Amino acid sequence: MTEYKLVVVGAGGVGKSALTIQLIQNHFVDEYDPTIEDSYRKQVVIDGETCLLDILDTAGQEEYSAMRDQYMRTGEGFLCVFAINNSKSFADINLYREQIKRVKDSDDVPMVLVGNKCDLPTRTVDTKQAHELAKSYGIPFIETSAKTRQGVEDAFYTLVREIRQY
Numbered sequence: 001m002t003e004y005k006l007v008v009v010g011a012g013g014v015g016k017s018a019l020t021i022q023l024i025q026n027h028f029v030d031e032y033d034p035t036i037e038d039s040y041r042k043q044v045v046i047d048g049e050t051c052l053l054d055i056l057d058t059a060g061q062e063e064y065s066a067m068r069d070q071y072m073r074t075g076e077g078f079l080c081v082f083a084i085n086n087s088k089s090f091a092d093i094n095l096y097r098e099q100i101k102r103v104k105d106s107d108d109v110p111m112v113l114v115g116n117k118c119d120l121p122t123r124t125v126d127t128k129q130a131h132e133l134a135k136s137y138g139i140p141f142i143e144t145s146a147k148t149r150q151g152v153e154d155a156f157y158t159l160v161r162e163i164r165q166y
Protein backbone atom coordinates (compact mmCIF):
# COMPACT_ATOMS: atom_id res chain seq x y z
CA MET A 1 0.00 0.00 0.00
CA THR A 2 0.93 3.64 -0.29
CA GLU A 3 3.18 4.73 2.57
CA TYR A 4 3.39 8.31 3.83
CA LYS A 5 6.63 9.00 5.71
CA LEU A 6 5.73 11.65 8.30
CA VAL A 7 8.15 13.37 10.68
CA VAL A 8 7.16 15.18 13.89
CA VAL A 9 9.64 17.89 14.98
CA GLY A 10 9.70 20.75 17.46
CA ALA A 11 11.19 21.87 20.76
CA GLY A 12 11.34 19.59 23.78
CA GLY A 13 8.09 19.04 25.65
CA VAL A 14 5.70 20.60 23.13
CA GLY A 15 3.81 17.30 22.86
CA LYS A 16 5.26 15.64 19.75
CA SER A 17 5.02 12.16 21.26
CA ALA A 18 1.67 12.88 22.93
CA LEU A 19 0.18 13.81 19.54
CA THR A 20 1.51 10.63 17.90
CA ILE A 21 0.37 8.40 20.75
CA GLN A 22 -3.07 10.01 20.68
CA LEU A 23 -3.29 9.35 16.93
CA ILE A 24 -2.02 5.77 17.06
CA GLN A 25 -3.07 4.54 20.55
CA ASN A 26 -6.17 6.70 21.19
CA HIS A 27 -5.16 8.12 24.59
CA PHE A 28 -2.98 10.83 26.16
CA VAL A 29 0.27 9.80 27.84
CA ASP A 30 0.35 12.50 30.58
CA GLU A 31 3.84 11.61 31.72
CA TYR A 32 7.40 12.83 31.47
CA ASP A 33 9.09 10.60 28.90
CA PRO A 34 11.65 12.30 26.60
CA THR A 35 12.12 10.81 23.16
CA ILE A 36 15.35 9.77 21.52
CA GLU A 37 13.83 8.46 18.30
CA ASP A 38 10.63 6.42 17.95
CA SER A 39 8.89 5.08 14.85
CA TYR A 40 5.21 4.17 14.53
CA ARG A 41 3.70 2.33 11.57
CA LYS A 42 -0.09 2.21 11.33
CA GLN A 43 -2.41 1.14 8.52
CA VAL A 44 -5.21 3.69 8.09
CA VAL A 45 -7.90 4.67 5.63
CA ILE A 46 -7.74 8.36 4.70
CA ASP A 47 -10.39 9.57 2.23
CA GLY A 48 -10.97 6.00 1.11
CA GLU A 49 -7.28 5.35 0.46
CA THR A 50 -5.76 2.42 2.33
CA CYS A 51 -2.32 3.66 3.31
CA LEU A 52 0.43 3.21 5.87
CA LEU A 53 1.49 6.09 8.10
CA ASP A 54 5.18 5.68 8.88
CA ILE A 55 5.68 8.27 11.62
CA LEU A 56 9.09 9.32 12.95
CA ASP A 57 8.76 10.88 16.40
CA THR A 58 11.91 12.95 16.91
CA ALA A 59 13.67 14.40 19.94
CA GLY A 60 13.51 18.06 20.80
CA GLN A 61 16.88 17.89 22.57
CA GLU A 62 19.71 19.77 20.85
CA GLU A 63 22.19 16.89 21.09
CA TYR A 64 20.10 14.88 18.59
CA SER A 65 20.16 17.44 15.78
CA ALA A 66 22.50 15.37 13.59
CA MET A 67 20.44 12.22 14.13
CA ARG A 68 17.37 14.24 13.09
CA ASP A 69 19.04 15.47 9.87
CA GLN A 70 19.89 11.93 8.80
CA TYR A 71 16.70 10.24 9.98
CA MET A 72 14.34 12.85 8.49
CA ARG A 73 15.90 13.05 5.01
CA THR A 74 13.28 10.46 3.99
CA GLY A 75 10.33 12.46 5.35
CA GLU A 76 7.62 13.38 2.86
CA GLY A 77 5.69 15.56 5.29
CA PHE A 78 6.52 17.36 8.51
CA LEU A 79 4.52 18.44 11.52
CA CYS A 80 6.34 21.42 13.03
CA VAL A 81 4.97 21.55 16.57
CA PHE A 82 5.04 24.28 19.21
CA ALA A 83 2.99 24.60 22.42
CA ILE A 84 0.61 27.51 22.91
CA ASN A 85 1.94 28.13 26.43
CA ASN A 86 5.63 28.10 25.42
CA SER A 87 6.66 31.24 23.54
CA LYS A 88 10.20 29.94 23.02
CA SER A 89 8.92 26.79 21.26
CA PHE A 90 7.07 29.10 18.86
CA ALA A 91 10.19 31.22 18.34
CA ASP A 92 12.09 27.97 17.60
CA ILE A 93 9.63 27.03 14.81
CA ASN A 94 11.57 28.93 12.16
CA LEU A 95 14.74 27.06 13.11
CA TYR A 96 13.14 23.65 12.58
CA ARG A 97 11.62 24.71 9.27
CA GLU A 98 15.00 25.98 8.05
CA GLN A 99 16.67 22.73 9.08
CA ILE A 100 13.97 20.82 7.17
CA LYS A 101 14.46 22.99 4.08
CA ARG A 102 18.20 22.31 4.05
CA VAL A 103 17.92 18.58 4.61
CA LYS A 104 15.14 18.29 2.00
CA ASP A 105 16.77 20.76 -0.46
CA SER A 106 13.32 22.28 -0.79
CA ASP A 107 11.41 25.34 0.35
CA ASP A 108 7.85 24.04 -0.07
CA VAL A 109 7.98 20.48 1.32
CA PRO A 110 4.63 19.31 2.77
CA MET A 111 4.35 20.73 6.24
CA VAL A 112 1.77 21.72 8.84
CA LEU A 113 2.37 24.18 11.67
CA VAL A 114 0.86 22.62 14.81
CA GLY A 115 0.03 24.66 17.89
CA ASN A 116 -0.45 22.08 20.64
CA LYS A 117 -1.81 22.09 24.23
CA CYS A 118 -4.81 24.23 23.30
CA ASP A 119 -6.71 22.66 26.22
CA LEU A 120 -4.60 24.68 28.65
CA PRO A 121 -5.83 27.97 30.13
CA THR A 122 -2.41 29.69 30.15
CA ARG A 123 -1.82 30.81 26.56
CA THR A 124 1.33 32.79 25.72
CA VAL A 125 1.35 32.45 21.92
CA ASP A 126 -1.33 34.50 20.18
CA THR A 127 -3.41 32.62 17.62
CA LYS A 128 -3.03 35.52 15.20
CA GLN A 129 0.78 35.26 15.23
CA ALA A 130 0.57 31.56 14.39
CA HIS A 131 -1.84 32.13 11.50
CA GLU A 132 0.42 34.88 10.19
CA LEU A 133 3.55 32.72 10.44
CA ALA A 134 1.80 29.82 8.71
CA LYS A 135 0.66 32.10 5.88
CA SER A 136 4.20 33.45 5.46
CA TYR A 137 5.35 29.84 4.97
CA GLY A 138 2.41 28.95 2.73
CA ILE A 139 1.36 26.07 5.00
CA PRO A 140 -1.73 25.27 7.08
CA PHE A 141 -1.83 26.04 10.78
CA ILE A 142 -3.79 23.56 12.91
CA GLU A 143 -4.44 23.92 16.65
CA THR A 144 -4.37 20.68 18.61
CA SER A 145 -4.70 19.12 22.02
CA ALA A 146 -3.14 15.70 22.49
CA LYS A 147 -5.13 15.66 25.73
CA THR A 148 -8.62 16.09 24.26
CA ARG A 149 -7.72 14.81 20.74
CA GLN A 150 -8.96 18.10 19.27
CA GLY A 151 -7.32 18.61 15.88
CA VAL A 152 -5.08 15.54 16.12
CA GLU A 153 -6.53 13.64 13.17
CA ASP A 154 -6.83 16.98 11.39
CA ALA A 155 -3.12 17.68 11.74
CA PHE A 156 -1.95 14.28 10.49
CA TYR A 157 -4.61 13.89 7.78
CA THR A 158 -4.02 17.41 6.49
CA LEU A 159 -0.31 16.59 6.20
CA VAL A 160 -1.12 13.49 4.14
CA ARG A 161 -3.28 15.63 1.85
CA GLU A 162 -0.42 18.12 1.47
CA ILE A 163 1.78 15.19 0.42
CA ARG A 164 -0.84 14.02 -2.09
CA GLN A 165 -1.02 17.43 -3.74
CA TYR A 166 2.73 18.02 -3.87
Ligand SMILES: Nc1nc2c(ncn2[C@@H]2O[C@H](COP(=O)(O)OP(=O)(O)NP(=O)(O)O)[C@@H](O)[C@H]2O)c(=O)[nH]1
Pocket residue numbers: 010011012013014015016017018019029030031032033034035036058059060061116117118119120144145146147148
Ligand atom coordinates in the same frame (compact mmCIF):
# COMPACT_ATOMS: atom_id res chain seq x y z
N1 LIG B 1 -2.26 19.67 28.78
C1 LIG B 1 -1.52 19.09 27.82
N2 LIG B 1 -0.35 18.51 28.12
C2 LIG B 1 0.23 17.98 27.01
C3 LIG B 1 -0.24 17.98 25.71
N3 LIG B 1 0.65 17.32 24.87
C4 LIG B 1 1.63 16.95 25.66
N4 LIG B 1 1.43 17.31 26.98
C5 LIG B 1 2.30 17.07 28.12
O1 LIG B 1 3.47 17.84 27.91
C6 LIG B 1 4.64 17.08 28.33
C7 LIG B 1 5.56 16.76 27.15
O2 LIG B 1 4.87 15.91 26.21
P1 LIG B 1 5.67 15.05 25.15
O3 LIG B 1 4.64 14.51 24.21
O4 LIG B 1 6.53 14.06 25.85
O5 LIG B 1 6.56 16.08 24.41
P2 LIG B 1 7.68 15.89 23.35
O6 LIG B 1 7.64 17.06 22.46
O7 LIG B 1 7.46 14.58 22.70
N5 LIG B 1 9.09 15.90 24.15
P3 LIG B 1 10.53 15.38 23.63
O8 LIG B 1 11.05 16.39 22.66
O9 LIG B 1 11.50 15.40 24.80
O10 LIG B 1 10.33 13.99 23.09
C8 LIG B 1 4.09 15.84 29.01
O11 LIG B 1 3.87 16.12 30.39
C9 LIG B 1 2.76 15.62 28.27
O12 LIG B 1 1.84 14.86 29.02
C10 LIG B 1 -1.48 18.59 25.43
O13 LIG B 1 -2.08 18.69 24.35
N6 LIG B 1 -2.07 19.13 26.57
Ligand SMILES: [Mg+2]
Pocket residue numbers: 016017018033034035057058059
Ligand atom coordinates in the same frame (compact mmCIF):
# COMPACT_ATOMS: atom_id res chain seq x y z
MG1 LIG C 1 8.72 12.98 22.55
